[PDB]
Write a structure and sequence with these properties.
Protein name (chain B): Large ribosomal subunit protein uL10
CATH superfamily of chain A: Ribosomal protein L16/L10
Order of helices and strands of chain A: EEHEEEEHE
Number of helices of chain C: 5
Largest sheet of chain C: 3 strands, antiparallel
CATH topology of chain A: Aldehyde Oxidoreductase, domain 3
Shape of chain C: elongated
Oligomer: part of a larger assembly
Structural class of chain A: alpha+beta
GO molecular function (chain B): large ribosomal subunit rRNA binding; ribosome binding; structural constituent of ribosome
CATH class of the largest domain in chain C: Alpha Beta
Distance between the termini of chain C: 40 Å
GO molecular function (chain D): 5S rRNA binding; structural constituent of ribosome
Helix content of chain C: 25-40%
Chains: A alpha+beta (136), B alpha+beta (135), C alpha+beta (134), D alpha/beta (94), E mainly beta (38)
CATH class of chain A: Alpha Beta
Helix content of chain A: 10-25%
Family (chain B): Belongs to the universal ribosomal protein uL10 family.
Strand order of the largest sheet of chain A: 3-6-1-7
Number of helices of chain A: 2
Distance between the termini of chain A: 33 Å
Number of domains of chain A: 1
Structural class of chain C: alpha+beta
Strand content of chain C: 15-25%
Keywords (chain B): Acetylation, Repressor, Ribonucleoprotein, Ribosomal protein, RNA-binding, rRNA-binding, Translation regulation
Number of domains of chain C: 2
CATH superfamily of the largest domain in chain C: Ribosomal protein L11/L12, N-terminal domain
Shape of chain A: elongated
Chain lengths: 136, 135, 134, 94, 38
Amino acid sequence: MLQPKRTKFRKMHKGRNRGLAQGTDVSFGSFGLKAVGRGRLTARQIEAARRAMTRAVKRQGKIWIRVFPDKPITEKPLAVRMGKGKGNVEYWVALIQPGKVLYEMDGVPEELAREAFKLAAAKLPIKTTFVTKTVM
Amino acid sequence: ALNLQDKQAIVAEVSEVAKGALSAVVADSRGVTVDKMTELRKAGREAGVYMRVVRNTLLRRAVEGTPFECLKDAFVGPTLIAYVTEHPGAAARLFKEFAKANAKFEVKAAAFEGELIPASQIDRLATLPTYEEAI
Amino acid sequence: YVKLQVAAGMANPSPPVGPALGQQGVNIMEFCKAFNAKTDSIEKGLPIPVVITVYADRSFTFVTKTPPAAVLLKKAAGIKSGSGKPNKDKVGKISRAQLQEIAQTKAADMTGADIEAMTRSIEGTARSMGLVVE
Amino acid sequence: MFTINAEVRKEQGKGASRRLRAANKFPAIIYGGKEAPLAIELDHDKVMNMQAKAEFYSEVLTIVVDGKEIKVKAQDVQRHPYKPKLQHIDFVRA
Amino acid sequence: MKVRASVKKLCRNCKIVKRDGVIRVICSAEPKHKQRQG
RNA sequence: AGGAUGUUGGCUUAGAAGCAGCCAUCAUUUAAAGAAAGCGUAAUAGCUCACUGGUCGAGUCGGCCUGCGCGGAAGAUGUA
């Protein structure tokens, strides 16, 4: 599970998730999984989708993970009233905007990359699409 | 399937063989296993006869180049052509005993002389001796 | 109608031949010594394939063929067993000449129009069994 | 060889450019040389098919505007964030 | 009969049919492949 | 209608013959036919696919962008 090794602060504001994404094109590999929806990606979802793609291509070629869950999310335990300070950090998320490229793959045929990305997309809470590297 | 460049090349080659040969025998060969074909191929190579199954459309194109344009009508149904390029006949001969013996397929029309040859009367070619008989 | 690969001047055994065509209606001893009778001329220890041909009255005829490519290639490489992992583990050498010999025998049994073609098929086998042609 | 038909834009801005893309077109610009830059409109799907070929970004294209051919090269492309669409193209005079 | 929300062809012989507004999968080969969306 | 030859490819195994598994996947005759896509056998056999010739005779194939619909959709007094 991806997680920052250390942070300047432990807890962060909720914030908002407006706007479109940066890094909207395949920059390392040849095929990419681009998010068309908006939402959060927990570190477990990222790891689950990575394993689904890693096993799909039988550990072949190269795989990049363009996102990183750097935002901590706190929760209050059960049977606890409101107040008495912010909750404890439970997991980390990466904010996703439409157009964000999540994963990139290289070294495999396209027809195999589509199935690998299709298996991984089933683990993610946001709608995605298949993209390929283009001549800028 | 077969790109247009393919089929053009298939025609060209069948046509070039048609120029060199001297006796063409055409037959149906549907409903015969590949072993009996493989056997007929060793009998063709042995007897110096060139054997091809080719699309009836595609043969009509080869033929027209000369002098087999009588054979057009022989290209309705499954077609097997027999080009005796070295010596004449022997194919006409070979096909009939092979035809009779195997009671599958038929044999259509042959062609020598730039004249179509009728199914029954092919017995002419199928009895012409050796070259190599005039001595 | 059954096909076997039997040792030259040897026949009869139960796990080898017996049961196999024995459970089809075939007279064992007859085929045994007829087979051996005609395969006497084969070199010693050449495994030869025979196609046995039985008819409704349990009577039979058979054809003998040339030994398998794998066999001749085993003998030509002087080995006993093909590679367990052909083309990952190499287990020997036949010259182009040995290929050609085997090819002419198997030519009596091939479908190649030329020496070269037959030889290429034999090479195909030789590759298939991790023997290099050297 | 790629030839493109274009029309000069009547007005610029965010409001005008979004109306173009709603009308199955998209703006572009032609600069380079000593001439003044030229703002143009392009038919989207027709240009979208041409840019799908790798030589579109390497060869020299001709844009006929007011019946006048201009030889240019594709400089930069602004694609839609998540749709197979174009938003803007920079053309530099060859 | 498999009653699921996502019906798909499981082999070459599976056919998609819509009967009375219900997407169904009928297979002439494998009776296990019989599905209906529900 | 054909779907062949080396050949039951090599290894393994009691057997492993396209079809438990491992490795290889060449070559021939080909119109075409994978050292086999699925069923089948103790292993063969046997069925079928890929592929190709024939018949038919003008369209047929599968991706994208979008509009509107379908399923997914089970609660308690009574349609609600």
